[PDB]
Amino acid sequence: SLTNFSQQHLPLVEKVMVDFIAEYTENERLKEAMLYSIHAGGKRLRPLLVLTTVAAFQKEMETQDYQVAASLEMIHTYSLIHDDLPAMDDDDLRRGKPTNHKVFGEATAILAGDGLLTGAFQLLSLSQLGLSEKVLLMQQLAKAAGNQGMVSGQMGDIEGEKVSLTLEELAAVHEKKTGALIEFALIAGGVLANQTEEVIGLLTQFAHHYGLAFQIRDDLLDATSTYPALLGIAGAKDALTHQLAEGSAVLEKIKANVPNFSEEHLANLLTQLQL
Amino acid sequence: HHHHHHSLTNFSQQHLPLVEKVMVDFIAEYTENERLKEAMLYSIHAGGKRLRPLLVLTTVAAFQKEMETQDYQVAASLEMIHTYSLIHDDLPAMDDDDLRRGKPTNHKVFGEATAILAGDGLLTGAFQLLSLSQLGLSEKVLLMQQLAKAAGNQGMVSGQMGDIEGEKVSLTLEELAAVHEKKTGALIEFALIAGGVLANQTEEVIGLLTQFAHHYGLAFQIRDDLLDATSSTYPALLGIAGAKDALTHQLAEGSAVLEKIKANVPNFSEEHLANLLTQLQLR
């Protein structure tokens, strides 16, 4: 059961986060700020995706699994703090509570985001991974979170507030803004489960489709320059179902190529994106 | 062993352009969004003293090692961190600067959202470059650990937070020193540490290089604060003449540290690091 899994495993991820912040931060106000944004909670989808992926290959959870998932969620947490700022999305509330800068001022919010981003790389560098995988995942996390990924995605999304984006261009923004960290989750899962490059590439495909599906569902719930604005409500529902079918078709291949593979939690998370 | 003697003559102009080249090529090649790319390149091309990468390379020169790709890569990653911190520090929410180096600041050119993301991109980029650098696996991991230690919650970011808190509550001498140590000292310390690691020095030498950086980094700040009060700072807390002595003592302690390194290391061109100390004197 997925809720059993998540309720066992997510408090451990959250422990890695909270303890890393309390133990590796000199300034107390900075520490408080970063803890507030972790404490506001969330789905913890990205760490959940790392861990379910590891379990999918029947490797049991290790410390190194929780550390990567924690690093990944520290990245997600920072991006929200910065995205909430007046200059960006300008959000007063997140999870029914005031946002970081509403509580702490903008200067502190900016620094907490900076602190969490640096913190994620520090944690990964100090984790219980071996040298070769530690280097691989740091590279992958930087690719996913940085100029080649999330930051370029965030810039593209903001540019799209004046210019009208086409379907391809909107999709390309989301692939960077949202899909990159989701892809890292799947890639990280494969590496942690000691898998091979064909398998890692297959997991990346799953994440590609999960990511797009996630974004279309988000736009559909929002309307109930987006997917509804371009493709129509019914056309959006088709795009969503198409993405979900592709993900299952990808999960098909992984069972065919790895006999030990258990798709049940990944299939569930994918299924949950339907309406 | 390794050996190459570096002359002092035009050392920075021989090597700093290669650091800029690594930075510029890295940003141009590993950035998807053109606007983000241009905003990051803007802040790089606005120039600066390049003190931090200069320290990395000078330290490698001091141990008579010939410069390789990975030295420039490490120097570039550090200067990326430095450039990011300036973009964020300049924002209206922080220092609120319209100008830096006689040119408009990143947010004045591109707006605040673009500047926030350019800083984020440069920060992540510094770690990406280092992760993809020509370093071997264990050195790579050590230097990533050390950069994050210096640049993050244990260092620069905690220091920046400390500095802002010191605007509304006046700080003591020892609180000021702790603020400067994290905000400025930490990346200076990284530069010297990295120089040592790049040159394959022992834990004993790396420890001494660290002490040098501490004295260099404090001397740098005292010198800059002494310039403001000539045309909560050291001069204010100590007097002008006591701050001049604060500077002289740091320089002396830096020299004493280089003396100790010269005793411990045969192949060592002390003048590279001694000259950087000399440049901080008042005339």
TrEMBL record, chain B:
Signal peptide range in chain numbering: none
Catalytic reaction equation(s): isopentenyl diphosphate + (2E)-geranyl diphosphate = (2E,6E)-farnesyl diphosphate + diphosphate
EC number(s) given by UniProt: 2.5.1.10
Cofactor(s) needed by this chain: Mg(2+)
GO molecular function, one term: metal ion binding
This protein's UniProt keywords: Isoprene biosynthesis, Magnesium, Metal-binding, Transferase
Gene Ontology, cellular component aspect: cytoplasm
Gene3D superfamilies, A to Z: Farnesyl Diphosphate Synthase (1.10.600.10)
InterPro entries: Isoprenoid_synthase_dom_sf (IPR008949), Polyprenyl_synt (IPR000092), Polyprenyl_synt_CS (IPR033749), Prenyl_diphosphate_synthase (IPR053378)
PROSITE patterns assigned: POLYPRENYL_SYNTHASE_1, POLYPRENYL_SYNTHASE_2
Domain of life: Bacteria
GO biological process: terpenoid biosynthetic process
NCBIfam families tied to this protein: FPPsyn (NF045485)
Family: Belongs to the FPP/GGPP synthase family.
Protein name: Farnesyl diphosphate synthase
Organism in which the protein naturally occurs: Enterococcus faecalis (strain ATCC 700802 / V583)
Organism phylogeny: Bacteria, Bacillati, Bacillota, Bacilli, Lactobacillales
Gene name linked to the record: ispA
